RNA sequence: AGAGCGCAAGGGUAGAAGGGGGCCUGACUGCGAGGCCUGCAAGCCGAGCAGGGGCGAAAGCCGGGCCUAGUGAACCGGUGGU
RNA sequence: CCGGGUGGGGGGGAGGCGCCGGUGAAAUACCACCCUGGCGCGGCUGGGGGCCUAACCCUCGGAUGGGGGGACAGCGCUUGGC
RNA sequence: GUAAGAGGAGGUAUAGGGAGCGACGCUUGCCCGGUGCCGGAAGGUCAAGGGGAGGGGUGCAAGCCCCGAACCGAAGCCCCGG
RNA sequence: GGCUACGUAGCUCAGUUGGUUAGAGCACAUCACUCAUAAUGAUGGGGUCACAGGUUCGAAUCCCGUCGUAGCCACCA
């Protein structure tokens, strides 16, 4: 009578004292999801760069070396000839200076925002208050300024991955959906190993591996030797 | 005096240097202004310390 | 005064403290060049045991005092009588 | 040519060294002929050469700014580097 | 937070919900890692006080003992400092 | 006197050390801003020491050696006051 | 140069973990009273949170750059 009856059965999964790494969280978290649906992973990831340290954010930008899920969409209000752009990629609506009303008077549905340079500018400076704090808008990295975002629309929807760091480092490497067997989730979460380890700070003294946590969700977690 | 802080013009290619003055009172940022290392050409040349 | 185990007498000028400020890195030198001279006591100090007939003190070194007691532990083989205080403990050793 | 030529003057200067603009960025690399100066030590003007680059159709110019001050031998160390 | 939140005990009895809709940075069923302020005992490592003497210090008609001091001092090094 | 001990003093705060003026008769004002002296369980910096996150060389490896953070430290000077 | 702290109303000042909405003391100002003064009361004027950049939807509230600032450390060919 807390966290369900299915996750005390799933509490005889754990007893808190291991490890797993990869591996046994590849197989074993393949079937520490029994449950629903598609939980991702929550790689539970954190470090110590004080929860803010002015500039020590993160964006963690990766390509997930499998794939995402479903879709973003992108959008992009991309000023004319970059619309062309997206009109090729996996972006709806693409309108360069119209479908900002279509963001700011209403009308939703897509991630990242992708944009341009321009609009950053004007699709930055209308949308400021829902896209960007919660995660969307310009970002100047959120796959969101350039052309460099069409190629980075792959990215959006074969393999994004966001880190940001707010209190933890926290981030949820997502993959897993809970079918994809033990192969295709060691192969990823390593290379999301690979993906923290990419993004490296300029000063951070602390453990820059712990928390690892591979619970996909709705199941254990116990780390993963914070490494393999 | 200083808010005029001299730097040496630190090459790249991994070194080869030549000696200036930077302005800080000035909008000059950094300075990567073309200048002839102790080997090659007129190639490069940037900006370091003091 | 002096060691009635190992010897061990006082130790002087050189023996030392210096002052020196001494040079070392923190620049040019941690505050570089720097130097002088000093000065060096030993240590030395006094244990009371009893062993055998009469009670005895040790003028003992510091770390030297389970040498002491092996010297008690000599003293119970041998054959100690009589009255004589340091006449005993001169043969002890 | 008493103007202006950063700041002291002297001197020189418009047949520019002044005042406006386009393209740059030679406050280059390896040298160094030979002189001025002077006890030394430094200070000083620098043909011309080899790489390469800017300008200009080109002739030709660029190893800082019209100049005479804007300086500190050597150790002891500091950073980048061979 | 003078509003209420937390939870045990239990009377008990067939039921109680998240949502797109709505408001704001942000949605409250359910899961995953930690910061802030504290509780309780653990890792590590310190701060104050009292009780006893057997170290060492003083004294008592020779004192083998009595007594008090008592982990202080004294002492030897090492520390900085005035 | 490096000491041992010695004097002080077989004296005990109506005592013994220091300074200041130098009978007795009348008298003693302004300032803690400085400085010294005093008194202080906040706070600052700060010596050796504890410590170990990171880190290096090296050997295949177990490993040996060194660099070494956060945080803990008093006397002292600053700080509160007389 | 290293470690601390702190400067916001004219003087003087806390506020101190946000999410507030800019105080208190005298100082200015006018009305109430009264014989009229001061004692008094009240409403307002005045803050540009040491200056500026950023994390945050909302920093006086956290991170940083310089100042001003005193503490002592501690360094200089």
Same mark, same amino acid.
């Given at each position: 009578p807390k966290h369900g009856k299915r996750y005390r059965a799933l509490l005889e999964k754990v007893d808190p004292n291991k490890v797993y790494t990869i591996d046994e969280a590849a197989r074993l978290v393949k079937e520490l999801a029994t449950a629903k649906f598609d939980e991702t992973v929550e790689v539970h990831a954190k470090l110590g760069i004080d929860p803010?340290?002015? #500039?020590?954010?993160?964006?963690? =930008?990766?390509?997930?070396? /499998?794939?995402?899920?479903?879709?973003?969409?992108?959008?992009?209000?991309?000023?004319?000839?970059?619309?062309?752009?997206?009109?090729?990629?996996?972006? #709806?609506?693409?309108?360069?200076?119209?479908? !900002?009303?279509? !963001?700011? #008077?209403?009308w939703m549905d897509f991630d990242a925002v992708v944009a341009t340079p321009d609009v950053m500018g004007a699709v930055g400076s209308k949308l400021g208050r829902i896209l960007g704090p919660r995660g969307l808008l310009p970002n100047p990295?959120?796959?969101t300024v350039g052309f460099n975002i069409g190629e980075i629309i792959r990215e959006i929807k074969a393999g994004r991955i966001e880190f940001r760091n707010d209190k933890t480092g926290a981030i949820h490497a997502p993959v897993g959906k809970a079918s994809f067997p033990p192969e295709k989730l060691a192969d990823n979460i390593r290379a999301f190993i690979?993906?923290?380890?990419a993004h490296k700070p300029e000063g951070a003294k602390g453990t820059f591996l712990?928390?690892?946590?591979? =619970? =996909? =969700?709705?199941?254990?977690?116990?780390? !993963?030797?914070? /490494?393999? | 005096v200083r808010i005029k802080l001299l730097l040496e013009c630190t090459e790249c290619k991994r070194?080869?240097?030549?000696?200036?003055?930077?302005?800080?009172?000035?909008?000059?940022?950094?300075?990567?202004?073309?200048?002839?290392?102790?080997?090659?050409?007129?190639?490069?040349?940037?900006?370091?310390?003091? | 005064k002096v060691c009635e185990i190992s010897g061990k007498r006082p130790i002087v000028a050189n023996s030392i403290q210096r002052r020196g400020k001494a040079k070392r890195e923190g620049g040019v030198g941690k505050k570089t060049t720097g130097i002088s001279?000093?000065?060096?006591?030993?240590?030395?100090?006094?244990?009371?045991?009893?062993?055998?007939?009469?009670?005895i003190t040790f003028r003992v070194a510091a770390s030297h005092?389970?040498?002491?007691?092996?010297?008690?532990?000599?003293?119970?083989?041998?054959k100690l009588e009589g009255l004589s205080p340091k006449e005993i403990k001169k043969e002890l050793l």
């Open positions: 803010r340290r002015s #500039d020590q954010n993160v964006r963690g =930008t990766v390509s997930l070396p /499998h794939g995402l899920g479903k879709q973003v969409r992108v959008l992009a209000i991309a000023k004319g000839e970059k619309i062309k752009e997206a009109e090729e990629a996996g972006a #709806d609506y693409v309108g360069g200076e119209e479908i !900002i009303q279509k !963001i700011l #008077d209403g990295k959120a796959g690979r993906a923290l380890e712990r928390s690892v946590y591979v =619970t =996909t =969700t709705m199941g254990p977690s116990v780390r !993963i030797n914070p /490494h393999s | 070194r080869n240097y030549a000696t200036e003055k930077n302005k800080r009172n000035t909008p000059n940022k950094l300075e990567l202004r073309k200048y002839c290392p102790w080997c090659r050409k007129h190639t490069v040349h940037r900006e370091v310390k003091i | 001279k000093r000065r060096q006591y030993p240590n030395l100090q006094k244990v009371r045991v009893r062993v055998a007939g009469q009670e005092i389970p040498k002491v007691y092996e010297l008690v532990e000599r003293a119970k083989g041998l």
